[PDB]
Amino acid sequence: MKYTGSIFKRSRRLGFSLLENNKEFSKGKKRKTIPGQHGNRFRSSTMSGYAQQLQEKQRMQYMYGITDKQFRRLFRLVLKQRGNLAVNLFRVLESRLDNIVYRMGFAPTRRSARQLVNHGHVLLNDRTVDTPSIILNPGDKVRLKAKTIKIPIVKAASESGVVSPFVETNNKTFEGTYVRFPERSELPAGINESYVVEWYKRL
Amino acid sequence: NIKSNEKRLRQNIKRNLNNKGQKTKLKTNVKNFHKEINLDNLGNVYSQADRLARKGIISTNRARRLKSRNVAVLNKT
Amino acid sequence: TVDLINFRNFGIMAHIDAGKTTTSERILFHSGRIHKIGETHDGESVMDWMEQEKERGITITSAATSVSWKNCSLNLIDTPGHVDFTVEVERSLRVLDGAIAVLDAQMGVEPQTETVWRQASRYEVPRIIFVNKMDKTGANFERSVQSIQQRLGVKAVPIQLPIGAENDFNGIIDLIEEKVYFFDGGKEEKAEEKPIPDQFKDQVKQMRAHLVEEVANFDDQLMADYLEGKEISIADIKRCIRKGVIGCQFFPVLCGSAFKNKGIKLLLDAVVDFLPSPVDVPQAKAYGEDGNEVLISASDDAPFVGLAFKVATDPFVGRLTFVRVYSGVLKSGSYVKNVRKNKKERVSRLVKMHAQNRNEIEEIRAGDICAIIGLKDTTTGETLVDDKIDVQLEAMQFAQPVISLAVEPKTKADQEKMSIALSKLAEEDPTFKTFTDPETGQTIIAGMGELHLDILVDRMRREFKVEVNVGAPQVSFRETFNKESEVEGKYIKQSGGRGQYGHVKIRFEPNKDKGFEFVDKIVGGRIPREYIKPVQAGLENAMASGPLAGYPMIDIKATLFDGSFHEVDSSEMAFKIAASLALKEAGKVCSPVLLEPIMAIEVTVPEQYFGDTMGDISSRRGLIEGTEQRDNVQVIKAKVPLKEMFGYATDLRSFSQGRGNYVMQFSHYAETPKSVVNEIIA
Amino acid sequence: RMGRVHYPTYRIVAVDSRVKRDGKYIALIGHLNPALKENKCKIDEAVALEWLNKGAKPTDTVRSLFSQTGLWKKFVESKK
RNA sequence: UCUGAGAGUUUGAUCCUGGCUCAGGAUUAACGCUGGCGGCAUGCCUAAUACAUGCAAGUCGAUCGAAAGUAGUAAUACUUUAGAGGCGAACGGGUGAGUAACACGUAUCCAAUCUACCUUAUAAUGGGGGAUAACUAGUUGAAAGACUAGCUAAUACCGCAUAAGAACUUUGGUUCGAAUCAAAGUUGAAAGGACCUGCAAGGGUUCGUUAUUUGAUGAGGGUGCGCCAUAUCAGCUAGUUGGUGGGGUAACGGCCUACCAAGGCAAUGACGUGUAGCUAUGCUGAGAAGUAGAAUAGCCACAAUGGGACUGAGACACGGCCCAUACUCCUACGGGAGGCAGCAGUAGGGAAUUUUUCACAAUGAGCGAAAGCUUGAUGGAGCAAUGCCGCGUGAACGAUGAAGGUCUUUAAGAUUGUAAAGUUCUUUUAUUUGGGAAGAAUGACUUUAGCAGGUAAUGGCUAGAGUUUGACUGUACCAUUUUGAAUAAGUGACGACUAACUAUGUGCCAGCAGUCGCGGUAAUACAUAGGUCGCAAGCGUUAUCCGGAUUU
User: Fold this and answer.
1) Is the CB of D44 under 7 A from strand E?
2) How does strand C252-255 pair with strand C127-131?
3) Is the distance from CB of A119 to CB of A78 less than 8 angstroms?
């Protein structure tokens, strides 16, 4: 869902952070224990391998904030082109419009990246976009539509935002460019692509 | 619906009467040809068939067929 | 665009069995000259037939029938096809400019003619007094005026004079002009004015002494010329008659006959002259929708406003909405606005629906009555507008469906089609209410009268083709009884996944003061507490049925005293089944009695039918004990059973000749008399 | 135009005056998208002469582009 | 790059055959729970049941008489048509009941076919006669209207003349059931409107006319072959089969007639039975293949039904017509009218699919020299969460889990829960205002320059100048365009298969389950409170077809 509500509850259930320790900031307490009446000293009573594949898939798609309809659309579109699509799937998921906005340091979270995109604060190729389902390509210029440059939050975020080697950005003019495709190693390895790929029983 | 339906109807009623007249006026000539066969009768048949087959009454292929049927029996005389 | 002083919308209002159908249809026949109706030559061309009063009324119920005269067009409307009703009269008076009222003269009491007069007097609706049944014995002009003055005191001015008596009435004398003799019989289309003979000429002047002075009090020139004695112009007295009929100070009275068709053209001239036009009177004043409901006039200007007053079902189209326009012009195919629904209604087309035909019309001017195809969602009482003006609401009376009837449905499909018909009939007439009774399962239809319900069933069997017989209302006759021995309940059966054994003895006492009180008296350990709640629930849910007819056994207290269960057998349900059997046996043994709700009926009559009231009350074994007065009338309290009130409605209506109303409210629950009790034994 | 709603499309197609458009066809002379008119149409220019030389005169919306290309000029030479 | 995912279930325990069953999609799907949105489609799968109301295709006055009106004493010019005549009526749109077959496609032969019109092109558009619509008058009648008489014109109708060229015919030259060629016999072509010029005459320009020359186009026929189930259907067919003469079709033909003769098919199934519009194709699978043929296209059948016919190039014509069967309606009760398988709507059924929707703006068609005219064709609007897509209901900070609830029931503590409260920011949408599209500048029209036959010129060709075409649109879109977290979350399951259990009541009762199976007093299980997991403006639930299903 585009708005998961209290996502920290999922964090306690899943134990899958977002930057380093901002998902388990010990607000209340830093725990990986499962919430609910089902047990806080012992785990659940139903377990399967399909369950852990789903656990990995949900962890990754909540770190990315993917909706199921959009997820299937992206899967179908990835099936279009050829090559070693296992890692290309992860690369294009990281190439999402909100994903790239986050990688540029323009948004503290994807939750906020979608808020930035939808409100007219994102402008690509001189064509206003409110749909973050855009796959960035090497050498694509991303701007902020400086009408919204006055915001103190974005000014503070741009100077000390996330910077990745596979893109470039300027911390003071809020302008960046996607330069090259990323690599799997620099990205978190807590999820397995093959789990989701073999998990695809819809088609 | 259709603005001009009775128009062509009453237009072609009189044309149908005229066409029936010409068809029977050729029928009498072909019947006379049945009674008597000779060159002059077939010449008048040629005249009348050229007059009527020009109209939408007699088709060209039917005219050829009937004229062939007439000349086949006239060549014997 | 078009003239407005010549534009007029009136209506003929009369009682049934007083010429309503005859007067209205014959006036339409005489005054029908336009191509939309043209009833004269259309009826002359075709042979004559007749219809039953109900069928003829159905075929004469009309919305807009246009007739023409020297300068003026009249849009007559016939909504009352009943004996007489309230909602149709309300709608018509709310949607008319003036009206022509015909009084009952073959029946001296005029049982229903007074209702329309009261409705128009409350609304200050202009109307004239005219008598049709002057061609039959027992009716006279002087008799009628004296009788109405004695009964009501309406302060009317007689105008027109008959020549002769009830059977000798063959000529009519106008007051404001000379005597008009009639040169033809039927349809009265030949009337010429002769000089009045001496023997009556003085009398007219004598009445000219009266009538003129009766209109010489609210006009300066009238008073001046009457004081001088100079002859006032007839135009001035005509204007004063208009002022009085719009001002409600007096009431012109005309004489004639519509059953024998006497005095028609003079009537048309009178309704052209004295009856006001929408321009000639302050326009329709309604309460605008601004959170305050301030009364404002329509003014008959460019902006349009209107209230829907009728909606009817018709095959091949759907819903046709008869509406009266108060201001402006409505365009075919426009987008009207409904504030109560708060939506844009899509107008499809506009049509004027007549007595026997419909005529599609592009535009309808202010003051006119028409109908619309379109507006699939507009409901009763809503206001629509296409010129974007302040909408208004106006409804000056309503009615209650108090006359209730339970009809047993003879077939499931019959009940479904009854529901479909009545749901659509409510669209045509929303003043009745339809339900399915959770008490008896019959169709509960509530309206306001014998002929009204008869024509309702006639309509649903003609248009909706719903054929069903009559039913019979009933009363739930709840049950109480006497004290039981204690109880002896047993249940021993090998069922329920195991055996089942149970012995119970409680004491179950009915008393209408205290309901279900459960007492537990286990001190030696005869039963565990685990079986107390089970028997409590069993008794609580088994109290709902009785032995006489399944009616509830209410207000009974339970006191558990003894019980016994078996070894590891005998699960919980054994106790409940034993308790149910014990309660059944106890209900059978104590010979229960029934209870009905007796109602107080406040029958209202100014001692005119008090003897009839006693007779009708006593016909149902009654309670007649005395009389009491409420501040302007005498109203009698009667304690009546519910079952006999359904026929008592028409019984009271008949003996009082439709001159009595009452109220039906729950007085108290009383034990049924044995006359009701003997019907239950089987 | 045809195709998607408010999405102009008009295939330059040889069709007779007896069958509905988008129905039966003789040949596909080309394609034209009436979205923006800047002389942007796919044409063959060969079969067009055969169509003009055997009757069944083509559409009238394409006269301007034939005039700019000079299709009229190269066709009236066959009459000389 | 490509060809395949398994699981539960019978025994005291265990292997095998083997069924059931689920895990995936699409849905002329409904419907429950409700319920933001647009782009994008989709939308009687159901009574070929009957339909008021209009749309549903009408066009030509520079093709004609003939009058009304507009101007003009008048003479005269023009709008309209009451009509004639010309075209369009067969197209088109919808339906699938019939139809299992040349329906379909296939390679097709048409030594057997038509195609007005358009198109290449040859010959020319000559000379006569008589006509009725219309109009008027009478009968009768509400009209319906017919009857009777007169007057009329045409590019309307019937002769005649020449006919390059044509068919016919006899002779002379040819092909592998036929044509090519020489001469000769017979015979038949129209018509003028309008413009320029010319004293006039006449000539020239355009349209059209007539045959003729190319074609092109589709239609039709014949054929190879395939193309449902059906043996609980083995004899069947009599112009039926073979041939001959005559006749019919645009053609060939038992197509028909008359005559003679006796077949023909089928055991690889004739005939009969029930079904089905045929195909391309949709959906499923990994494929062969299966299912179906929603939107789409081609073809074909019918046009309330059964016979029948004219017209025209084109028919037995949705909406033309004659009659018969049957239906609806009006009537003056004498007589007739019409049939929405056109668009909506409607009557009914169905569980059910939207509005008695707007412009002909664009396209296309038809008619027109041309102003241009008609378009429920077409292009658009609306409605429905019906589907795909996207997208709001916020976002960062915010503690040792705020209050309260649930569990812990034991009372530590957790869950609710950074969610809260609160701080910070934010404006797609909500809200404020303006501009404002594209589509349509195509297409014709008028000025213009030149071009070629032409000349005395007028008229067609391109280059641009102008004339203009909007239901859409008040649209998309754009603009520190105003205010403002403000304008919006429901929902399947949580006993195993199969992502989700805590507590209580229930006592084989209430009930649940796709399979197994639980409830007879401790239910991981029924129900309830909470929480949880999965989706999400959707969630489910059934029928549907396929990988399982290799269970033909």
Assistant:
1) no
2) parallel
3) no
SS3 C130: strand
Q: Half-sphere exposure of A68 toward its Cβ, with a 13 Å CA cutoff?
A: 4
Helices of type H across C463-596: 532-542, 572-589
CA atoms within 13 A on the CB side of D45: 13
Q: For C127, list phi and psi in degrees, rounded to 5.
A: -160, 160
Q: Residue C136 to residues C140, C184, C477: CA-CA distances in angstroms?
A: 10, 19, 53
| Experimental technique for the deposited model | cryo-EM
Judged by C1' against the alpha carbon of B25, the nearest nucleotide is E158
What is the stated resolution of the deposited model, in angstroms?
A: 8.9
CA proximity to C542, closest of C584, C483, C585, C593: C584
Find, among C84, C73, C67, the residue nearest to C29 by Cα. C67
- Domain range list for chain A: 7-92+189-199, 93-184
Residues 51-70 of A with CB under 7 A from strand E: 51, 54-55, 58, 67-70
Q: Report the number of distinct structural domains present in chain B.
A: 1
Establish whether the CB of B17 is closer than 7 Å to any nucleic acid atom in strand E: no
Domain limits at B44? 1-77
| Fold of domain A7-92+189-199 | Ribosomal Protein S4 Delta 41; Chain A, domain 1 (1.10.1050)
Q: How far, in Å, is the CA of A40 from the C1' of nucleotide E65?
A: 108
Strand E contacted by A17 CB (< 7 A): no
Query: Beta strands C99-103 and C12-13: pairing type?
Result: parallel
**CATH fold match for the domains A7-92+189-199 and A93-184:** no
Strand partners for A140: A178
Backbone φ and ψ for C656, nearest 5 degrees, come out as: -85, -5
Q: Are C434 and C376 a contacting pair, CB within 8 Å?
A: no
> Which tokens belong to D5?
């709603």
Closest residue (CA to C1') to nucleotide E116 in the complex: B56
- What sign for the dihedral angle of Cα C176, C177, C178, C180? negative
d(CA C30, CA C172): 18
| Distance between CA atoms of residues B13 and A27, nearest Å | 100
CATH topology classification for A93-184: 3.10.290
Identity of residue C203? Q
Spatial neighbors of A39 by CB under 8 A, at least 6 apart, are none
Number of domains in chain D: 1
